[PDB]
Structures are given as structure tokens and as C-alpha cells.
């Protein structure tokens, strides 16, 4: 996941010219935790994987 | 009463009643008694909450 404010592409020549550049939706969380679990701090069971739609 | 005529008196002292008759009542019930608020099956019920 790369953030940019630019809008070029990856592959374009301002860019950095090298690799695939696609959109990418939402923050990245760090494979651990999904978030909201529990009022009082018990939590929920996370989701894992890459790519994973769930 | 029995409704008996008298021989030679006549029973004026009893009647029939014709409609009932109204009167002021005293307090009654003061109010409710406790009642529950909120659902104990919930308590501490887990909540899925994070965003995408």
C-alpha cells in the first residue's frame, strides 16, 4: 500500500516509473487486530489474510 | 320486608328503593410499583464496530 496525494501514476514517467500502480481503498490495519471488539475491552474475533474479501 | 299487610295498621316505615345513591370515596392506590429498564440479555453483549 502506497499513499500519494499526486494523482500519477506508478508506471508514469513523473511518477516513479516501476511497477503497477492501482487504487487502494480505506487505511491499512496491521494484521493483528480489525478494531471495534467488545464495549468493555474483551474483543471480537479479527480477520486475517491478504487480498481476503470478508 | 315480606310485603305483609296489616291487619288494621299500615307498614309506612318501608320502602323501596328507587335509584342508588352517590357518595364521596376516600384515597385509593398511590401509584405503581418498580419496574425494570434496560434488557439484561444484552449485558455485556459483544459489539462488532470496526470500519472497512
Not at chain 1, 494523482?7 to 516501476?18: A, F, K, L, R
Not at chain 2, 376516600?26 to 470496526?50: K, M, V, Y
Request: glycine letters at 12%; charged letters at 20%; a neutral charge.
Amino acid at each position: 500500500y502506497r499513499i500519494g496525494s499526486y494523482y500519477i501514476t506508478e508506471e508514469d514517467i513523473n511518477p516513479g516509473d516501476s511497477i503497477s500502480l492501482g487504487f487502494g481503498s480505506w487505511a491499512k490495519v496491521t494484521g493483528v487486530i480489525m478494531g471495534t471488539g467488545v464495549v468493555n475491552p474483551d474483543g471480537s474475533v479479527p480477520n486475517a489474510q491478504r487480498v481476503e474479501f470478508q | 320486608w315480606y310485603s305483609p299487610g296489616g291487619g288494621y295498621s299500615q307498614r309506612t316505615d318501608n320502602d323501596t328503593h328507587t335509584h342508588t345513591i352517590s357518595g364521596s370515596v376516600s384515597l385509593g392506590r398511590d401509584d405503581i410499583s418498580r419496574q425494570p429498564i434496560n434488557t439484561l440479555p444484552p449485558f455485556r453483549a459483544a459489539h462488532i464496530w470496526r470500519r472497512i
